[model samples]
Target: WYRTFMMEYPSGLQTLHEFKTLLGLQGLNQKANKHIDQVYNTFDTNKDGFVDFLEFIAAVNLIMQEKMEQKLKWYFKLYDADGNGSIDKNELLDMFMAVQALNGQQTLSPEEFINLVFHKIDINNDGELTLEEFINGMAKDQDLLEIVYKSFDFSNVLRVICNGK
Candidate 1:
């Protein structure tokens, strides 16, 4: 919330370090570290090394949207580490690792999950997932929808945010 951000980050800006400080996830695992990297990717505008109020708003708003196409859009960007508008096997695998680490209980290992995702979503067999393939392929599949949301859940992060206030 603006109340929280403005009061804590009085300059209306936060470096990725400050963002992590705000989340208070400092003591977590390596995978959780990658998760925060994606978060910084989400809200950073112009690669400026600071998250301003407007950028902060979009990310906080993302937590509340829950499940929507917009959510998938952001997730796609988060997982697409190269920012080439597509997710390769390594990129998806990397994200799965973070998700598994943050979410804790592993429904399937990252290898298993990534294999399954490639099996289904990489319909053209190009060995990479474009955005259309990712969202469109995922939306129609029941089990994947279940897994995707569960796998990507950052609600634990949000609870800490709320509690810290």
Candidate 2:
């Protein structure tokens, strides 16, 4: 059973590697490799680098159990532009502006927002988002990269909201 689990986790495990590299974990933790390796090993029931579906499901379900709400919210907000519960480009721009405005800074100008969308989603620099570009951008920054990660990490939800849901 453990051997089966290892095969299942490789895909998601590999995804984390990309995330860590993108976030520059290499500089922060010399033991990052060892630590992540241990995590990988913990799931590698059969001593192989690969994980089977059951093992994968177990590992990921554990991740989801702990962080599902956060992960789901991140994905939802990435696509949902308007606070009205629907997402569109304009809603996205509005949210961006709201964030900027709260910073005691000027809102993003129309031109700036346009550029931001293009910079984020136009992977080929063609000034348009191809389907491939759209998916790529979705993974690249489900939110606005650095700020999004920090906000989520720091529990900005509580700081920004008094109710503390």
Candidate 3:
């Protein structure tokens, strides 16, 4: 299935264009296209605007393996809005907002929910979630894992891959 997507590229590398197509995003709207771009960028570690087959395989392994610490680090990078190596209140709120938007549901007050999330995830009362804090918190709360994975757009990709679509 993966090779079918790479056959067109003579160099055996999948360009972003090929990836977008492989993910069936050729007709996505602006926002969806942007999100797909972010997903591709996350996996394209070499920054060459193309994903090597090995890079793609590694990403697949990461997704399938679901190593808690590695997954937490990967998701922490996504949720760390300011890229300061920590998830602050605003960053957490932004992540939740994005998740809610993606899920097309809204039931929580922004401030209240952010407070609750921090109360749970921010161990040591530091008011911010470091990688260790996030992992430890997620370890205790399995439900939080789904939301974190959704926030990183992993679920969508996994759905397509697992469904063999």
Candidate 4:
């Protein structure tokens, strides 16, 4: 299975487009596509314009290993679209809207979502979420935890990618 990357991808790397097709989430809204891009970017963390087999495994393992802090940090990076190491409301809005496109089953509207996120997660009322604040806040808040769980369900497609390819 792992050899697929080596034998198929040639350089043991796959492009961003291939990642999206493998996940089988094509033809969604632009907002939804960014969510897909974020995960691909996350997997291709070094910004090399390609993702490798090991790169793919870490995310899948970090997530379903059910490591809370690992998941939290991973998501913090996922949502940190600007790579400033902090997530502000605008960044939050985009990814959540993207999440909305994928699932359309949000407990909070885009506006309402960030309002609650900042309200709950911004420990210093700093209007931005740091990794410390995100991990600590998300670990404690049930509503935020549920929201994360709802938005964070990507394993279904990961399994399909594994099965199909």
Candidate 5:
């Protein structure tokens, strides 16, 4: 199954387009595409616009193994859109919106949901979430983990590759 995606490329590297197709995100809108591009960019460590099979395998293993600390650091980079070391309300809202778009689910209104997230996970009550706060909160909340997993399309990859284990 994996080799099929790399067979057409001479270098045996999968481009972002191929990765997007593999993830079934080719027809998504700009926001979704941009999010997935960010994910590809994050994993394409060589910055060569292509994901080597080794890098791809490492990423899949990281997710599959539930390497929480490493994955949280990676997710912190994604959520911290401004490179500001913290996730503010706007950034969190944008992430939530993108996740909702990608998953096609909206169990709560955005405003209500964001407020609820802050209420539940904003440990310092400072209106912003630090990496520690995010990680600790997620560690205590399975639903939050699921939201994040869905946002990054982790479940899809696991399902496709591991039959959801």
Candidate 6:
């Protein structure tokens, strides 16, 4: 259902609504409009109605303490190399590609790659991958970032967690 919508209206205001509808509010209680909005409203640091990428990273980094947090910080620094405090499309794409390689995937089209990262990070489908969605989703499952990070090398702790790797 959601994939069909994506196929029809690639970009538009409806996309946001469709995404929110798809994610729904079940994860947040279903009392409200489940999906990402509830999650967004919960962790929106600036409350500017939009969740940027850095805010998401910070939120996730804070919650997953221990080795997970350590690896997260390292990945953050690696991606934020320019010191701009936020990651642009290029940084995200590079990071995604690196992860793909680590997972031993032979090849993935740009669209597939973007969608993979988007769905992974953009838990809410608000057309923008805000910090809230990323952080909240990862925080809910601390092991998630660990799994994704496993594909990368951050001190050679090959089999970090019991799951996801």
Best by lDDT: 5
Alpha carbon lDDT of residue 91, candidate 2? 44
| Full ranking by lDDT | 5, 1, 4, 3, 6, 2
* Clash numbers, per candidate: 0, 11, 0, 0, 0, 7
Off by over 4 Å in 5: 1-10, 162-165
Name the weakest run of 10 consecutive residues (lDDT summed) in model 2. Answer: 156-165
lDDT of 3: 0.72
Best of the two (4, 6) by TM-score: 4
TM-score of 3: 0.77
Query: Cα deviation in Å at residue 159, candidate 3?
Result: 5.3
Clashing pairs for model 4 are none
Query: Candidate 2, overall lDDT?
Result: 0.45
Candidate 2 stretches greater than 4 Å from native: 1-87, 106-110, 122-143, 147-154, 157-165
- Over 72-119, each residue of candidate 6 has an lDDT whose tens digit, in order, gives 554554554364655445655655555553355445654675566567
lDDT of 5 by residue, 95-158 (tens): 8888887778658667887888888889999998898888887778887777777678665676
lDDT of 3 by residue, 1-165 (tens): 666435556687888887777666676555556656776788889888888887878787676665567767777787786889888888887677666645553566568777777888888888999888888887788866676665655646767656652
Q: All models: lDDT? A: 0.75, 0.45, 0.72, 0.74, 0.79, 0.45
* Per-residue error (Å), model 1, residue 119: 2.0
User: Which pairs in model 6 have colliding backbones?
Assistant: 23-35, 24-34, 24-35, 25-34, 25-35, 51-130, 56-131
> Considering TM-score, where higher is better, how would the candidates rank from best to worst?
5, 4, 3, 1, 6, 2
Residues 64-143, candidate 2: write the lDDT tens digits.
Answer: 35454444454344435343453445644544444443343344464676568668776768654444554456457665
RMSD values for the candidates in order, in angstroms, are 3.1, 15.9, 3.1, 2.9, 3.0, 19.1
Clashes of 1: 0
lDDT, residue 74, candidate 6 = 45
